[PDB]
């Protein structure tokens, strides 16, 4: 889920940016090097809503670089334990299901649900099909699933989705 | 039988009045351990032998294999049955079926290397898999060879320049896309370079550890004077006899026989004697 | 450690204000409006508009007055912020469904007035 | 048992005129060679042209194989044309006084010069082709101005008939 919390970052600014556009260069550098990053504690950041303040720039002795502590507000999104999360479904292989909730490589195995749900290769678009063939889980539809697991994969997350709870189907 | 219990691992109770209690191992002994597991919501401290225990893990934790055919591989479990436990590896998405006793709780990162080798002094290569007595090396063929240990080592050119189909300059650790060849459509990262070939890596590609080779033009960016006695035949040092210590295309370092000096002389003023 | 059943959060998140799906959508589209207004600036990678279309095609609310109204009625009753976000973003249809979604909703609120507030939000969903 | 797979002065004059017009404009040519016979013919025809017009801007050839071909062609004068054998007493025509070894084409120095590429693609030609694209005279003549001058190495139909 999407939170809105306070983050901290340090900016090493080269002396070539010590001009009238210094603080703007600091914001541009922050926007450059906080986007597309994930951590095992504060979650995957989405975007920087605003920057609270730019700290005092301490000049490092021995280097020209200046260290700028930055306090800012960023949207974070990580898996949670015991929570139901909306998901996106894509094409189905002969082994598993490809689900992508933003950057999440969430997977559904054969040891998370009872045998009321099956998959067949006879249909030209592969999809999850029951015996009654009422609910269809194919590419680009709305489902709900529960995640309990979380792992770190070098700014990537590996998790497992569950479908044990009822009414976790299409709207 | 055999027992291999390590501290920090999660174990359960399978029989007795204290069944279904999961705790963390602190120490281990030989046969009758009298182990001390840190149970959940329990401050009073218990004792359990080795036969009563079983390596049961919670769902979604980093596991490693201690022995068997699947040893040396890590992953995350999906569901622990009575005796049927499955996991997916960190390298490939192949389902691994392991016994519950053959699993341990560790926080280390999986290993899953890639140095430049020389099969013969005209061909370079990169090893894809470490074996006991052989090297599995993918050269510029697309075919993996199997050679002995005693290949030689060549100095890698980390400052080499390669050209793609757009005639753009690329270097080491650059992401390039494949738009031509037998494997067009994939994407790789530059590790080593040649005159007309480039080595590529894709972490999602599962064949030979992600190593591959593509041609450079089918991608797109996403002295004899040394040691010789010479005579300075011109200039202020004319007539001095010396031995060239170092030389370039223009100047030469001449070690004068008569003095203790080594001087820089233009090579147009030197005559080999 | 952390869990939703016992509402165990990391200790730093005592003021972690949580934004609803349409709130994220309006902030992200405002960011694109300012980015289009910002000349000579490079665009961001696939993650931003990926999240933007995820907030677009799964949006529960469409007008900011609906978010204002649901917040203005929800802070009066005693809710946790995470519980408030879960109730306002899960979009339930029945009361027993609302109990069966999250274990932290078990016994927190009376069933009849929970049915009443789902009736209110189902009147103000579009 | 004969081969059966298939003007020259005009083609040679046109190629020499193209090379001279490109080198007199200050630009550098990057003509590639793939065969040894074509390379030696191009070098000897160039060298007699450079000696005849008496202009001193350099011509260079590359690789450690074309040099070996040059040495072997120098050592096999009796297997050459009538002019090379007859004027050998004056000078060895394969001992080039204008075509010299290319130390990366004089480190790709500026100015008008003639460079022979090792292949006819492959290495030691694509770097020159990319380094000289979009230049003043980027004349590269395959067998960014591109010219087409082809020299036949085999006999034609009338030669087989003869």
Automatic annotation (TrEMBL), chain C:
Q: Which domain of life is it from?
A: Eukaryota
Q: Which residues form the RNA polymerase Rpb4/RPC9 core domain?
A: 11-126
Gene Ontology terms for molecular function: nucleotide binding; translation initiation factor binding
One GO cellular component term noted in the UniProt record for this chain: RNA polymerase II, core complex
Q: Which UniProt keywords apply?
A: DNA-directed RNA polymerase, Nucleus, Transcription
Q: Where is the protein situated, by its record's location annotation?
A: Nucleus
Instruction: Provide the GO biological process annotations.
Output: transcription initiation at RNA polymerase II promoter
Q: What does this chain do?
A: Core component of RNA polymerase II (Pol II), a DNA-dependent RNA polymerase which synthesizes mRNA precursors and many functional non-coding RNAs using the four ribonucleoside triphosphates as substrates. Pol II is the central component of the basal RNA polymerase II transcription machinery. It is composed of mobile elements that move relative to each other. POLR2D/RPB4 is part of a subcomplex with POLR2G/RPB7 that binds to a pocket formed by POLR2A/RPB1, POLR2B/RPB2 and POLR2F/RPABC2 at the base of the clamp element.
Family the UniProt entry places it in: Belongs to the eukaryotic RPB4 RNA polymerase subunit family.
Protein name, per record: DNA-directed RNA polymerase II subunit RPB4
Tell me which species this is from. Sus scrofa
